């Protein structure tokens, strides 16, 4: 249907007037990447913009910003027409003025702060119907053009004289503000937007089709995640972005109201928003109003949760609605709300990663001006547990640390301030380092699921067991073609066992990095404290959080501490078991081989373990991690100092010889002392940097075999037969 029909999509780049396409559309287009284009759009309102080319788009799709996409009165997923035409020319007048409340409280000269610096060397097209936004000085400014050089197009040149009175504008009746949230105000969530985006999209954009079909569009959604994670943000974003009518319910709000006042208040919310459909209904803190465990005292609270049910279930299809609620943990809410015809969908919005945090940090760092020494790629690596709302108050508190010490000397106090200071005001790296050091980065910290940073090169030796792990994880994900042809079935779990400090934890994080699978780590002590006094109930959740993360490596680390809890050494009269070992391996038997979740245990004392976990179908492949030998003992040293400035004098072949029964962790203990003996001489020297050969000679003096000899023969005995361990 011709290359006059294009679709809307949301840009990767942040720049104001551009559109990004691909070469197939270019081999359809045959026009430049520096050209101007005049686009046609809905409601007789159209606008002028330029194009470039790039791979991130598909064969056919169109990247835009909101500032473009709003004037065109279009939304993501609308048919647009680029109209590839070269009308190219300069314009003349281009008289602009600021917008109603967007300048409220800021005053003064706008030429050198705003406007001018935005146009320079990047002449930007303009039309009588372009509103645009300029970022700076802690503020988002909005503009409009009542007249310019006559239409359609005007293209600035590094001359053109712009003239502006200032003063507000009349607020446009229907024209949205750009300060309303949209898919660009959310970051780190990319994967769960597209999930929410598909699922809610077409029944909002295409109310008719469903009325034409017998398909039931899912209507109800539950968003998980700990507080401050952006649940309420993601909700309103979608409602704005999709065009829907967004009504909002607070839990406390309707539990604040008088008994019997809530019922009419909760009922009206649907009844009213029934009339305005298509409609979103968002319920903040569903936990407040529907808390069924031992639930509540007295009817009036037990009554309102049954009112909610008869609205969800007793929804007859009404006309058209979709309900969205939010809560901190999936639990604590009445189970009867998750049945079908009620909130059947679930979207778990976890904490962000560093790649997510940098995405967030840039969003709250946009509008403000920064010094050149800032990094923000390092910050994301120094903020560990942080949700989005922590990481926003880390930007706004760092920026108040800047404007206290800067303008206390200016000490100017009046009704409003103008932009020159703000423009010549910046935040430095010393502030971020300061606001990161307060207790504000105190933040919620719980089970994290991520792709690990460790690579294969980060571990030395072990080259064959590296080859065997990729057999057992890489391939069944890579080649589902095979394993049908030859039949059989992949084995699910693995068990590493060996001397302490020999590399088991690392080698589990390496394959996750290799297959880009998520990695969940559950350490024996942590697992056994949540059992607390005689109760846990959270184990089934780490298998859930593993299930919705697939492909996933699920790693049970230092699995020996649990068995020695029941008892170690001499031993009890009984075997080594707890009620938290049993509910693990009921749940292993639960997960299907069609799942690509993959389990790995590790133990430093194979002597003690429960045979139940070695049974075929639980942890079958047994892998014995030996101590390193000379040629590998170089690989270890060669590795962990890869970031250390070692001097040329050293012989790593020589270290590796004098050492024999050292663990890989104890080699790092030598390399550790050497480096800390170096810094003592340097610090002395303040009354030259490099690591020196003599240093390694002194460190090597105090080195310590971490594993005894007489216990090496014990690993060598279990290396042979650990299969025998079950049955007697």
Ligand X SMILES: Nc1ncnc2c1ncn2[C@@H]1O[C@H](COP(=O)(O)OP(=O)(O)O)[C@@H](O)[C@H]1O
Is 590 within any annotated ligand binding site? no
In this chain, which of 102, 148, 561, 659 binds a second copy, going by CB under 8 A? 561
Neighbours of 210 (CB within 10 A): 15
Distance (Å, rounded) from C-alpha 251 to C-alpha 274?
20
Distance (Å, rounded) from C-alpha 480 to C-alpha 482?
5
In this chain, which of 17, 229, 262, 327 binds ligand X, going by CB under 6 A? 229
Is 227 within any annotated ligand binding site? yes
Q: Are 244 and 204 in contact (CB under 8 A)?
A: yes
Chain residue whose CB lies nearest ligand AGS:
664
Does residue 299 belong to the site contacting a second copy (CB under 8 A)? yes
Per-residue x/- track, 161-200, a second copy (CB under 8 A): -------------------------------------x--
Q: How far is the CB of 621 from ligand AGS (least distance, A)?
A: 15
Q: Are 80 and 390 in contact (CB under 8 A)?
A: no
Count of residues that interact with ligand X, criterion CB under 6 A? 17
Is 350 within any annotated ligand binding site? no
In this chain, which of 363, 515, 613, 623 binds ligand X, going by CB under 6 A? 363
Which among a second copy, ligand AGS, ligand X, none contacts residue 228 (Cβ within 5 to 8 A by kind)? Answer: ligand X
In this chain, which of 7, 140, 164, 233 binds ligand X, going by CB under 6 A? 233
Does residue 604 belong to the site contacting Mg ion (CB under 5 A)? no
Which among ligand AGS, a second copy, ligand X, none contacts residue 363 (Cβ within 5 to 8 A by kind)? Answer: ligand X
Q: How far is the CB of 356 from a second copy (least distance, A)?
A: 18
Which among a second copy, Mg ion, ligand X, none contacts residue 479 (Cβ within 5 to 8 A by kind)? Answer: a second copy
Q: From the CA atom positions of the chain, what is the Rg in Å? A: 32
* Region class of 284: left (phi > 0), else alpha (psi between -120 and 50), else beta: beta
Using the structure block, give the residue that is written with the tokens 């009542």: 146
Does residue 482 belong to the site contacting a second copy (CB under 8 A)? yes
The burial class, CB within 10 Å (0-12 / 13-18 / 19+), for 597 is buried
> Alpha helices, DSSP H only, in 215-256?
231-242, 251-256
Does residue 663 belong to the site contacting ligand X (CB under 6 A)? no
Q: Which whole-number Å values give the CA distances from 464 to 179, 305, 379, 621, in the listed order? A: 56, 59, 38, 15
Which among ligand X, ligand AGS, a second copy, none contacts residue 61 (Cβ within 5 to 8 A by kind)? Answer: none
In this chain, which of 392, 502, 656, 677 binds ligand X, going by CB under 6 A? 392
Is 503 within any annotated ligand binding site? yes
In this chain, which of 89, 92, 171, 216 binds a second copy, going by CB under 8 A? 216
Does residue 43 belong to the site contacting a second copy (CB under 8 A)? no
162 or 309, CB closer to a second copy? Answer: 309
**How many degrees, rounded to 5, is the angle at CA 708 between CA 706 and CA 712?**
115
Residues 163-202 that bind ligand X (CB under 6 A): 185-189
Distance (Å, rounded) from C-alpha 37 to C-alpha 82?
7
Is 502 within any annotated ligand binding site? yes
The burial class, CB within 10 Å (0-12 / 13-18 / 19+), for 12 is exposed
Does residue 401 belong to the site contacting ligand X (CB under 6 A)? no
**DSSP count for the chain of H helices, then E strands:** 28, 24
Q: How far is the CB of 5 from a second copy (least distance, A)?
A: 7
Using the structure block, give the residue that is written with the tokens 């980065």: 441
Residues 2-31 that bind ligand X (CB under 6 A): none
In this chain, which of 505, 521, 596, 603 binds Mg ion, going by CB under 5 A? 505
Using the structure block, give the residue that is written with the tokens 């050494």: 569
Nearest to 502 by CA among 676, 723, 715: 715
Pair type for strands 52-53 and 63-64:
unpaired
Residue 638: in which H helix or E strand, if any?
A: helix 630-640
486-505 as b/e: b if 16+ CB within 10 A: eeeebbbbbbbbbbbbbbbb
368 or 510, CB closer to ligand X? Answer: 368
Is 34 within any annotated ligand binding site? no
Does residue 350 belong to the site contacting ligand X (CB under 6 A)? no
Q: Are 257 and 265 in contact (CB under 8 A)?
A: yes
Q: Are 333 and 287 in contact (CB under 8 A)?
A: yes
Q: Are 88 and 9 in contact (CB under 8 A)?
A: no
Residue 576: in which H helix or E strand, if any?
A: none
Residues that bind ligand AGS (CB under 6 A): 459-462, 500-506, 602, 604, 615-616, 636, 639-640, 664-665, 668
SS3 367: coil
Tokens of 594: 């069609």
Which among ligand AGS, ligand X, a second copy, none contacts residue 189 (Cβ within 5 to 8 A by kind)? Answer: ligand X
**How many degrees, rounded to 5, is the angle at CA 644 between CA 682 and CA 691?**
40
Q: How far is the CB of 612 from Mg ion (least distance, A)?
A: 11
In this chain, which of 55, 167, 415, 464 binds a second copy, going by CB under 8 A? 415
Does residue 561 belong to the site contacting Mg ion (CB under 5 A)? no
**Residues after which the chain is discontinuous, using a C–N cutoff of 2.5 Å:** 687
Does residue 330 belong to the site contacting ligand X (CB under 6 A)? no
485 or 648, CB closer to a second copy? Answer: 485
Per-residue x/- track, 240-269, a second copy (CB under 8 A): ----------xxxx-xx--x----------
In this chain, which of 73, 575, 693, 697 binds a second copy, going by CB under 8 A? 575
Tokens of 140: 């988002």
495 or 585, CB closer to a second copy? Answer: 585
Which among a second copy, Mg ion, ligand X, none contacts residue 505 (Cβ within 5 to 8 A by kind)? Answer: Mg ion
Does residue 79 belong to the site contacting a second copy (CB under 8 A)? yes
Is 727 within any annotated ligand binding site? no
In this chain, which of 57, 360, 443, 517 binds ligand X, going by CB under 6 A? 360
Tokens of 315: 């929804």
Using the structure block, give the residue that is written with the tokens 């049908």: 484
373 or 464, CB closer to ligand AGS? Answer: 464
Q: Are 58 and 142 in contact (CB under 8 A)?
A: no
Is 622 within any annotated ligand binding site? no
Which residues would be at the binding site for ligand X (CB under 6 A)? 185-189, 227-233, 360, 363, 388-389, 392
**Which amino acids are annotated as binding site, given as ranges?**
227-233, 328, 364, 501-506
**Which amino acids are annotated as binding site for ATP, given as ranges?**
227-233, 328, 364, 501-506
């Amino acid at each position: 249907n011709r290359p006059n029909r294009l679709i809307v999509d949301e840009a990767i780049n942040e720049d104001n007037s551009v559109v990004s396409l691909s070469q197939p559309k270019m081999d359809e287009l045959q026009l430049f990447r520096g050209d101007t284009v005049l686009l046609k759009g809905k409601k007789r309102r159209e606008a002028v913009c330029i194009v470039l080319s790039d791979d991130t788009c598909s064969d056919e799709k169109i990247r835009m910003n909101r500032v473009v996409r709003n004037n065109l009165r279009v939304r993501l997923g609308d048919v647009i027409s680029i109209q590839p035409c070269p009308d190219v020319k300069y314009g003349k007048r281009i008289h602009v003025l600021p917008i109603d409340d967007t300048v409220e409280g800021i005053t003064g000269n706008l030429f050198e702060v705003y406007l001018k610096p935005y146009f320079l060397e990047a002449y930007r097209p303009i039309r009588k119907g372009d509103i645009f936004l300029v970022r700076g000085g802690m503020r988002a400014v909005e503009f409009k053009v009542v007249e310019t050089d006559p239409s359609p197009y005007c293209i600035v040149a590094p001359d053109t004289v712009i003239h502006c009175e200032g003063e507000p504008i009349k607020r446009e009746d229907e024209e949205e503000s750009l300060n309303e949230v949209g898919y660009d105000d959310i970051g780190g969530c990319r994967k769960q937007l597209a999930q929410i985006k598909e699922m809610v999209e077409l029944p909002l954009r295409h109310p008719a089709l469903f009325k034409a079909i017998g398909v039931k569009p899912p209507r109800g959604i539950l968003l998980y995640g700990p507080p401050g994670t952006g649940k309420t943000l993601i909700a309103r974003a979608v409602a704005n972005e999709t065009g829907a009518f967004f009504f909002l319910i607070n839990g406390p709000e309707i539990m604040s109201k008088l008994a019997g006042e809530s019922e009419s208040n909760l009922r009206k919310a649907f009844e009213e928003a029934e009339k305005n459909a298509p409609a979103i209904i968002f319920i903040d803190e569903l936990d407040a109003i529907a808390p069924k465990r031992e639930k509540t005292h007295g009817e009036v609270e037990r009554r309102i949760v049954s009112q909610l049910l008869t609205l969800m279930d007793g929804l007859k299809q009404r006309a058209h609605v979709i309900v969205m609620a939010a809560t901190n943990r999936p639990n604590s809410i009445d189970p009867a709300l998750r049945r079908f015809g009620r909130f059947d969908r679930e979207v778990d919005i976890g904490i962000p990663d560093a790649t997510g945090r940098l995405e967030i940090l840039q969003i709250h760092t946009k509008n403000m001006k920064l010094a050149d020494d800032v990094d923000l790629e390092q910050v994301a690596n120094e903020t560990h547990g942080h949700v989005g709302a922590d990481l926003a108050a880390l930007c706004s508190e760092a920026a108040l640390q800047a404007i206290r010490k800067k303008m206390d000397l200016i000490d100017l106090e009046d009704e409003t301030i103008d932009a020159e200071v703000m423009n010549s005001l910046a935040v430095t790296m010393d502030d971020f380092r300061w606001a990161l050091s307060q207790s504000n980065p105190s933040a919620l910290r719980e089970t994290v699921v991520e792709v690990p940073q460790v690579t294969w090169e980060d571990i030395g030796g072990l080259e064959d067991v590296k080859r065997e792990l990729q057999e057992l994880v890489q391939y069944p994900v890579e080649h589902p073609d095979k394993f049908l042809k030859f039949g059989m079935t992949p084995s699910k779990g693995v068990l590493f066992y060996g001397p302490p400090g020999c590399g088991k934890t690392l080698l589990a994080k390496a394959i996750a990095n290799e297959c880009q699978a998520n990695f969940i780590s559950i350490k024996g002590p942590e697992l056994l404290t949540m059992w607390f006094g005689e109760s846990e109930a959270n184990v089934r959740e780490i298998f859930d959080k593993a299930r919705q993360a697939a492909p996933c490596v699920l790693f049970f680390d230092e699995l020996d501490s649990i068995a020695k809890a029941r008892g170690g050494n001499i031993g009890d009269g009984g075997g080594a078991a707890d009620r938290v070992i049993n509910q693990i391996l009921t749940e292993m038997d639960g997960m299907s081989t069609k799942k690509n979740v993959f389990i790995i245990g590790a133990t430093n004392r194979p002597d003690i373990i429960d045979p139940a976990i070695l049974r075929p179908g639980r942890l079958d492949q047994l892998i014995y991690i030996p101590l390193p030998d000379e040629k590998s003992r170089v690989a270890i040293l060669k590795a962990n100092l890869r970031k250390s400035p070692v001097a040329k004098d050293v012989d790593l072949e020589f270290l590796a010889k004098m050492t024999n029964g050292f663990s890989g962790a104890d080699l790092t203990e030598i390399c550790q002392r050497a480096c800390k003996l170096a810094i003592r001489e340097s610090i002395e020297s303040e009354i030259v940097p490099e690591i020196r050969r003599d240093h390694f000679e002194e460190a090597m003096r105090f080195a310590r075999r971490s594993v005894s000899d007489n216990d090496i023969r014990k690993y060598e005995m279990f290396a042979q037969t650990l299969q025998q361990s079950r049955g007697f």
